[PDB]
Design a binder for this molecule. Structure first.
Ligand SMILES: N[C@@H](CC(=O)O)C(=O)O
Ligand SMILES: N[C@@H](CC(=O)O)C(=O)O
Ligand SMILES: N[C@@H](CC(=O)O)C(=O)O
Ligand SMILES: N[C@@H](CC(=O)O)C(=O)O
Lengths: 330, 313, 330, 313
């Protein structure tokens, strides 16, 4: 009997993991500049763990991530599923938590899909991307990684696509699942999994994007003292399918913003109350009578995460009670 | 002799209820201070606004020598904004301490009473002076610049997430170990004594496939400033970046902040702030950056002078 | 059809939840002074949620918690299981994380067992114990609480008995599951569970304490710069069954301490390497060759938690590989 | 002109490897300083000890005017202890910065290089002066009193868990926003210049059913001090409490600390410290409390004077 390594596919999309600057010590750099091959070759030990094949999907900063790249990824994973044992997606850190949740809801492939990035560019002293990529390959290769939904692997930690968020602007340790914690820790190329997400993911969702050319239009508005209603009115004037509110506290809205969203909701715009507060649920049965206005409470989904779910909810239904039920199940 | 402490009530879950009722509900306040209450407004802090800010700064500044310290009762939702506004505009050199409650007055294990007691402890402490406007919540004294609401329901929600608290309160005493270095109160140029309105500053949000429609609506209204809640280290979605690049050369100040809950939006990363005429917010989150941008716009419209204000206060 | 409330039993053991002082505003108090009845009557709304029956088991500060009270609790729960729908145990906060883990390993009753305490005494302004107790009753009454092991409920949060630990000396928010996060959050008397512990608990362990009169002797030694070997030698001289090391960093030992524990291990004393560091695993395959010395790595179990498991391991076996396997499964 | 910076190497994962190799591996150090390296010892910091502490304090104090600042390379396991010892005993008014690495030198994405660079940045910054002994790890400047190792393997492990960091390091610059209030360095009475050994102080651990055998072994050896790693707010298991109550009246100083990772061990809770002659450690964790108790025992054996040292440093 001979040892055979898993086949792992790296789908590259850009990010600081592929960024470069002209000094190892200066902070200035440009994103999404280095190709997949360079990234693979910067981690010689990948041969110890897997047979790795790189595909460049796009090469962008994830600040410019968009619906089309999401659709491209989910269809590619779902199409290529039987050709490989696992997927790693190199990606910018800025919107990784959004892509990860989109994929967590739309991937039907039953093989691990692991996202990874780097907070320091590839050119920098003590660059994090090499060891991150190695650890993402470890996770994508591990049989025990299956059936946990789509994953993010950063700073020696396996995180679920739903709860994972970027907590700090610069720290290599930025990614945390701030409400429910990580799924497992990685040491010496091995994972001790102690948790799995309970919310329904991947092949247990009704979201099927195989045939979609676009996603429903959903925007985000912020609340704060003396908040203008102009952002909200602009989305309503443009025929937006949905609006997510980054509320204050427990999903609360500045009155002007409330009035514009209450009206929009009456016309059939889906409105989700979320919170600019970085941890904790936007609950039902607090200061906003959601049933009355036809609003939906986002639970622990932050505004960018709630947008993902809301867009996907809007592909199945425009009924707010059914959208609320979706927000309670996925 | 006990210190004279004034409670300025503004609403919030800590009260709907009047200043007099909240005082009498904590009779042990009489052990530590002579408290007088005045009702400024009575609103949920989700409806906090510039007019209330101006009223508060003006009242503290004018009433400063009639009392030994102030406590401001406030909703928790925007307490972090009001605290930083007052941090930059209070000229009174006596402690100003904001407090709220995450549970209702009538709920099991309501936090308001002890929160109020400890806010008065803090306002009455001579060591609390010259530390800027403060927030006291969950036995902790927090500086008004860094303090933010971190959880939607936790009594322990308020934290100074970048630089930590100033001291902790135990048995009615504070062991202070820190003070903020950024200039505050009477060390700032902001003087709101004769202003009846503040520059219009709005906040836009970045995310994948972000619409430029919000940013355009602010530009079309002739907003004096726009704060971006960027992705990561203050980054902008291309459509948003395009609109703001235009606003910055067309009479609208642009501050890059971040939707990310901790850490600075830095210069010298991916964005050439000098080329576009943008200002990096540092550790000021979007709502905090709005406060400081509104006040900077009372002094100057020049990006470089705004960037220096953002580096000093 | 008529609504019937669950039957919940409160087993009282003491703690600050039952403490009292002479002022609502001064910090001084005495622990484990108030009886169960007073605690129940301080939460009038308990009638809305359950039929509550209180039993005083002991009335102590949990700084004086001990093996006999553990045995008393586990046997009482296992004996009384069919007489009630759920258990709440009021307890001091200081060693709640140890009792909770002991019960998580020894309770065979398939009904919820929820521990609760209070960081402020019952007499204090804004005392936390009333709402904590209410929330613990909510959790013990919830059908969805079953099969999650033994729980701690504090500060509106449901925490698993294994990972839960006291993080701060005074804060009402002190209890956190610092490695893997909480199981669910409580809002308006309802729980949204998103996680369950993967490590084996309750009726899936081999630990059966029904017949035990005592537990094996296991002590804890601390490491630091210039650490004395005298604590370790004292436990070895007394015939201790086990010793847990609160190591520095990744379970490392000051050399004098290492030498004494290496020798003890050769004579059949079980030695577990844990860490004084508050989060993260004490791993295998780092700076200590555990196989060589016959030592056991504690994983994420902190020293007091590792003591619990080690004592229970020693009731089944004295073989270090088998003890290591236990530390990898429970 | 670049500042002269001295690296004093002591071992740790950041190196086994010599001071000269570690320097040459980060050639960009030449952009910011003139670095000279000296090997003090070469050990895993799990074997750190009093002799090394004394060597380091003595060397810095004596070499202070020959250089512009010091960086000390050290294992991470007990860096938090060494930093606080030096915090209390360094009399040199130039920056002293400790640094280590959580990953080996030869591992993927080793943290040591950038950690070292940023430690030199910090040591070279004029603004770093008069802030006490520092720890620089993961782009963060941490005070030596509060800093502790919070995770067994994370590169981001070091945090000042009670009062937060002093500043963050970006693009070779520090934006300092805090400084420690507790007295340090040249504001302390501790003078180690002529000492060749330190008072014997041991640490005992509390947990359910705790043995008194460790505490008794220290008492029987005539230890000068015992620090208790208490449960909760510095509480003691009855057997341990009994033994320590005896030690405190029999020539052994007793400090109550806590195994709990954050927050103070307070007076005025469950334990009558005055009655027993005990000292409460405040936010000093057991290993930190040992450092300060050893140094207090060089000045006094009196519990009340020890309690005042614990309240000031
Ligand atoms: N702007 C970069 C940041 C990073 O990857 O760290 C991106 O998200 O593509
Ligand atoms: N909505 C309330 C929340 C609170 O005070 O806890 C307010 O901010 O006024
Ligand atoms: N010493 C008390 C502390 C508390 O309950 O909060 C106990 O553990 O019993
Ligand atoms: N055992 C090593 C750990 C490290 O340096 O990361 C030391 O402290 O010397």
């Amino acid at each position: 009997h001979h040892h055979h390594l898993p086949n792992i596919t790296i789908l590259a999309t850009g990010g600081t993991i592929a960024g470069g600057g002209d000094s190892a010590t200066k902070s200035n750099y440009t994103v999404g500049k280095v190709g997949v091959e360079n990234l693979v070759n910067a981690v010689p030990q990948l041969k110890d763990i897997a047979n790795v094949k790189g595909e460049q999907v796009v090469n962008i900063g994830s600040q410019d991530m968009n619906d089309n790249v999401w659709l491209t990824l989910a269809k590619k994973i779902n199409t290529d599923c039987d050709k490989t044992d696992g997927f790693v997606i190199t990606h910018g850190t800025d919107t990784m938590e959004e892509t990860a949740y989109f994929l967590d809801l739309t991937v039907k492939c039953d093989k691990p899909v692991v996202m990874v990035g780097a907070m320091r560019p590839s050119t920098s002293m003590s660059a994090d991307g090499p060891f991150n990529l190695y650890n993402a390959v470890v996770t994508a290769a591990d049989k025990a990684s299956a059936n946990r939904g789509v994953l993010v692997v950063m700073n020696d930690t396996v995180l679920d696509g739903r709860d994972v968020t970027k907590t700090n602007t610069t720290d290599v340790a930025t990614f945390k699942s701030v409400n429910y914690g990580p799924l497992g820790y990685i040491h010496n190329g091995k994972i001790d999994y102690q948790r799995t997400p309970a919310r329904k993911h991947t092949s247990d969702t009704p979201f099927d994007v195989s045939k979609l050319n676009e996603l429903p239009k959903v925007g985000i508005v912020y609340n704060y003292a003396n908040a203008s209603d102009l952002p909200a009115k602009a989305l309503v004037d443009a025929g937006y399918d949905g609006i997510v509110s980054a509320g204050v506290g427990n999903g609360n809205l500045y009155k002007s913003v409330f009035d514009t969203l209450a009206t929009a909701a009456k016309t059939g715009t889906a409105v989700v109350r979320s919170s600019r507060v970085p941890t904790g649920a936007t609950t039902q049965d607090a200061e906003v009578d959601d049933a009355k206005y036809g609003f939906v409470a986002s639970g622990t989904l932050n505004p960018q995460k709630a947008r993902v779910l809301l867009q996907l909810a809007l592909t199945q239904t425009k009924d707010p009670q059914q959208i609320q039920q979706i927000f309670n199940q996925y």
